[PDB]
Design a protein around this ligand. Structure first.
Ligand SMILES: Cc1cc2nc3c(=O)[nH]c(=O)nc-3n(C[C@H](O)[C@H](O)[C@H](O)COP(=O)(O)OP(=O)(O)OC[C@H]3O[C@@H](n4cnc5c(N)ncnc54)[C@H](O)[C@@H]3O)c2cc1C
Ligand SMILES: CC(C)[C@@H](O)C(=O)O
Length: 455
């Protein structure tokens, strides 16, 4: 990467905000996944949207790849600079603007995390529900199409993103639903917002997100329920959803995951396949949701609810850190699967996955947003064991195809990145692939917008 080009970058954002140092680049060449670190040629921190546009234009017209970088908590190698180029760390734009409490909406820049937004919303009676376990950039969550434990009731990022400000690859500024606009529904033209949610930085750079806010629940109750088998826990989940109990959270941990979270946190739950549950409503509706949910779990051998305030906070902090609890079993890197299937097929595939984990030499922990028909298998890797690494690939790839055989999807929330590109081709077929690629080509003709990812 030439000296003239570095100086041009410095002319846009300022000398302290451009780095070609090896250590700085290596810190931006990987996320939380096992994908090998591939350092960008430079890291740049733009200070405002005009600078983002000018950096993109400079890179695009010089043939230099662009890698958007949020908080680096992705798990599919999205930020890995597989073709080098300029990593654009967006987190110095960290302002919350256009807070509209009366319309339930807010605008956030990429440096704002969910924790920052909800802390600033304290005493407002509103909150933002989509809750990945990591302290992630909200614009990064828009880019990956993230969900979370609350999504079963309050929706995913796709459900809660109202508008996006996007710097297109050549530097043009797009407001996907129109500058400053926010509303509950629209039929005006083609919905551009949904195209950029889940685009993983391959269609442009999200520089602000307009988010739907939600009213805080009147009352909240959380509990855990232990089961004799995976089958019993997942049958309960499916029957709770089919009875239309509006649970706020319903999370599955197998016995391995439960034990790992016990060891990594303040919990001392029975080591067994377990559901973490949370209910929102008034006192009347809570008692009614509880009684219907306990009846279903009892029918499948579930324990009486272990109730949980500080202890719901420790409960959900343990769940949110399950990824790190799993890593701490083999102090190793990990790969995560992320399939999502029609809910009636969830018992088949979860039980089958548990049986396959045991039948193989591999270690795995299972945790899942099962209210969405979604779960993750966390598979540890010795970073220096090449034989283990292909067995992990082979396992994750066979699980993905089993989900596809059931009518599901290879990723419910994490995205495709580097790891699921072949599975995506099988999921949507040749006309789906060509259509997606035609969309990529019109927004990024030169193929410089995070190349090598998704497609
Ligand atoms: C402990 C843990 C728990 C997690 N739990 C969940 C969970 O429950 N649900 C879930 O969905 N994910 C979860 N994740 C994954 C991850 O946190 C999410 O995918 C999150 O949305 C990534 O955001 P980020 O800014 O950290 O992404 P990064 O890793 O910085 O980037 C991810 C991808 O998005 C692109 N990108 C980032 N920011 C932008 C932007 N502003 N504009 C355009 N493209 C951009 C990058 O180029 C890359 O391709 C978890 C991760 C960890 C470590
Ligand atoms: C599996 C990890 C990465 C996240 O998706 C979670 O559900 O906690």
């Amino acid at each position: 990467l030439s000296q003239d080009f570095v100086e041009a970058l410095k002319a846009v954002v300022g000398s302290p905000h451009v780095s070609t140092a090896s250590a700085v680049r290596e810190q931006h060449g990987h996320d939380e996944s096992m994908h090998r670190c591939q350092p960008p040629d430079a890291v740049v921190w733009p200070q405002n949207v005009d600078q983002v546009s000018r950096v993109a234009s400079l890179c695009y017209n010089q043939g230099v790849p662009i890698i958007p970088f949020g908080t680096g908590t992705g798990v599919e190698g999205g930020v890995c600079a597989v073709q080098g180029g300029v990593c654009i760390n967006l987190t110095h734009m960290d302002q919350i603007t256009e807070l509209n409490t009366e319309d339930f909406s807010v605008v956030v820049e990429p440096g704002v995390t969910r924790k920052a937004l909800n802390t600033h919303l304290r005493d407002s009676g509103l909150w933002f529900p989509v809750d990945p376990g990591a302290d992630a950039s909200l614009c990064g969550m828009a880019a990956t199409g993230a969900s979370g434990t609350n999504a079963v009731r309050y929706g995913t990022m796709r459900d809660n993103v109202i508008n996006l400000e996007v710097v297109l690859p050549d530097g043009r500024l797009l407001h996907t639903a129109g500058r400053g606009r926010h509303y509950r529904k629209s039929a005006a033209g083609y919905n551009l917002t949904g195209l950029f949610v889940g685009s993983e930085g391959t269609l442009g750079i999200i520089t602000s997100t307009t988010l739907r806010l939600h009213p805080a629940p009147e009352a909240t109750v959380a509990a855990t329920c232990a089961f004799p088998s995976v089958q019993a826990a997942v049958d309960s989940t499916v029957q709770i959803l089919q009875a239309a109990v509006p649970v706020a959270r319903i999370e599955f941990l197998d016995d391995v995951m439960m034990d790992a979270c016990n060891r990594h946190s303040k919990l001392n739950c029975p080591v067994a396949p377990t559901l973490f549950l949370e209910f929102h409503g008034s006192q009347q509706t809570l008692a009614e949701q509880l009684q219907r949910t306990e009846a279903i779990t009892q029918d499948n051998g579930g324990s009486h609810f272990s109730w949980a305030a500080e202890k719901r906070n420790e409960l959900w902090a343990a769940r949110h850190n399950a990824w790190y609890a799993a890593l701490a079993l083999s102090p190793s890197k990990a790969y995560s699967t992320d399939v999502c299937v029609p809910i009636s097929r969830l018992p088949e595939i979860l039980v089958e996955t548990k049986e396959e984990i045991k039948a193989s030499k591999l270690t795995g922990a299972i945790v899942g947003h099962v209210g969405d028909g979604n779960f993750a298998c966390i598979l540890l890797v010795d970073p220096d064991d090449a034989e283990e690494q292909r067995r992990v690939k082979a396992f994750a790839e066979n699980l993905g195809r089993r989900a596809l055989a059931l009518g599901g999807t290879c990723t419910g929330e994490h995205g495709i990145g580097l790891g699921k590109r072949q599975l995506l081709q099988e999921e949507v077929g040749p006309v789906g692939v060509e259509t997606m690629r035609q969309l990529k080509n019109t927004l990024d003709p030169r193929g410089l917008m995070n190349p090598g990812k998704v497609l």
